[PDB]
């Protein structure tokens, strides 16, 4: 079934399987939610990805 | 564990150093991709009925989380069934034709029987004419 | 008592010293997994009617508590019906062929009888003319 797939498709599945996991693992929507409170208080909204 | 067999071998085909927005892939939460997601599941629900997508495929669509995998499953399951219906049309066509072949083979067998049935009456009429003439 | 026969056996594999989120499993109460539980239970009902899913398996889905268990159960019974509907079509396909097989040999038995019938009138006819010649 990967003969009907495309190269931009296999790169897109791998990108989502990385992103769908770690959003649910770290609970990233809460990390972005604390960052909005600094946005309304400083005017700054910064994150480090390490 | 979080990636597949084909997804882990992407690391070998070169250049993965380069950002994904250089290879045509962007992170997008916008009204275009929610409209494409709501279309692609409504299209699958319209394909679940009329027996175009199996119940194996639709549960893979609900647990996909990527608009291109769930696009390829609609494409893959349509090509499989439309191949199966085209060969089912073909096997039903040749079956009535071999039925048309076996009825034709027996009626010329009936036809060849009555002509060999007739001549052996005719040549034995020559025999019963022959014996008493002595 | 609270676990299955398979679920007590993953302890024998060398992985349960580590967290579950290292093997792709997280706890989730979101809009994502709540929509999946609706989409599996609605697809179960559309499979219950149109005779694709039995009443025994629907009772297993309601008391399943896992969104991947009831994914593997709807795919289980749908594979059970598609093999039965394929073999019953093939059993009906050979049944018309074997009736057509036995109707073929019986009319050839009507064919092979009348060629050996008429020659028997012929060979006794030669005995008639040979007796009168003496
Ligand atoms: Mg028990």
Curated annotation (Swiss-Prot), chain A:
Name of protein: Portal protein
- Main role? Forms the portal vertex of the capsid. Probably involved in head assembly, genome packaging, tail attachment, and genome ejection.
Q: Superkingdom of this entry's organism?
A: Viruses
Location of this fragment in the whole protein: 153 to 202 of 806
Outline the subunit composition: Homododecamer. Interacts with the Cargo protein 1. Interacts with the major capsid protein.
Species: Bacteroides phage crAss001
Where is it localised? Virion
